[PDB]
Design a protein around this ligand. Structure first.
Ligand SMILES: *CCC(=O)NCCNc1cc(NCCS)ncn1
Length: 281
């Protein structure tokens, strides 16, 4: 099998900086021959080698190549010169989910339901292929032109075959105690997102990381008075201190029961990406 010609920087007309990470820079670029917009992640090798992020960059590449699903950002090509690596990723036109959370204050019942469903749909794929995100957050969940989700950031994800702490607010308690992450770590992260979509804020917030960590292990959060009752129950079955008792985990017998939850009564899981996402309040 012959892969398309190995690309090079000159093949593009670079545009605005979409995002700036710690080890990389993401710039919108247009391919010259095709006139296609790709978001090229640009990483400096010398800075990668010194910071020991060689595994992290490799893992990000390997995972995003393997994913073949609409709710996940596609890696179209990899190329490099002397000092830099270039990652040809898809361009999420609308931006962060967090962006749209802040913009509208909080999602209503239909909007939450729909976008919750898409994350579940995508998680079932990711965990089905034996990968654990470990850093799932509204910032990582991106939205394309038609306003569907496209989950990104897989450098820190864990691939299973038979050591890292994520963003403080969406961290599961078993990471802070046992140093061992599972599929259900993401399902904890899922519950926080469901809460955040309804409340407008994640469940655990404080002045610093330590106090946030403190509240998580103690399970210190509570619901507003208007919080959707069927969404509340789902969160309750997802934000559990014991990872084996979390709705959706292997001990809770896969994703079937999670999808079955009353909160997803009207949702047709058939073809969500072909469906039309609700407008945001
Ligand atoms: C929340 C911050 C933000 O807006 N980041 C830029 C996201 N836009 C974007 C991302 C990508 N790929 C993500 C690779 S890390 N492509 C196109 N636009």
């Amino acid at each position: 099998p012959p892969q398309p010609r190995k690309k090079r920087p000159e093949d593009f007309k670079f545009g605005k900086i979409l995002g700036e990470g710690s080890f990389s820079t993401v710039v919108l670029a247009r391919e010259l021959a095709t006139s296609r917009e790709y978001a090229i992640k640009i990483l400096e090798k010398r800075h990668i080698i010194k910071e020991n992020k060689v595994p992290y960059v490799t893992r990000e590449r390997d995972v995003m190549s393997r994913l073949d699903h609409p709710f996940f950002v596609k890696l179209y090509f990899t190329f490099q010169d002397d000092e830099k690596l270039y990652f040809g990723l898809s361009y999420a036109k609308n931006g962060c989910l967090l962006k749209y959370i802040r913009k509208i204050g909080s999602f209503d019942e239909t909007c939450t339901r729909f976008y919750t469903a898409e994350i579940v749909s995508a998680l079932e794929y990711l965990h089905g292929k034996g990968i654990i995100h470990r850093d799932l957050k509204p910032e990582n969940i991106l939205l394309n032109e038609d306003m569907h989700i496209q989950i990104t950031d897989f450098g820190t994800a864990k691939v299973l075959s038979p050591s890292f702490v994520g963003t403080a607010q969406y961290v599961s308690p078993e990471l802070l105690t046992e140093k061992s992450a599972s599929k259900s770590s993401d399902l904890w992260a899922l519950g926080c997102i469901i809460y955040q979509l309804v409340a407008g804020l994640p469940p655990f917030r404080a002045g610093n990381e330590y106090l946030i960590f403190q509240k998580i292990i103690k399970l210190e959060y509570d619901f507003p008075e208007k919080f959707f009752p069927k969404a509340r129950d789902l969160v309750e079955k997802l934000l559990v201190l014991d990872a084996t008792k979390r709705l959706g985990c292997e001990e809770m017998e896969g994703y079937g029961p999670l999808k079955a939850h009353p909160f997803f009564e009207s949702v047709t899981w058939e073809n969500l990406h072909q469906q039309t996402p609700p407008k945001l309040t």
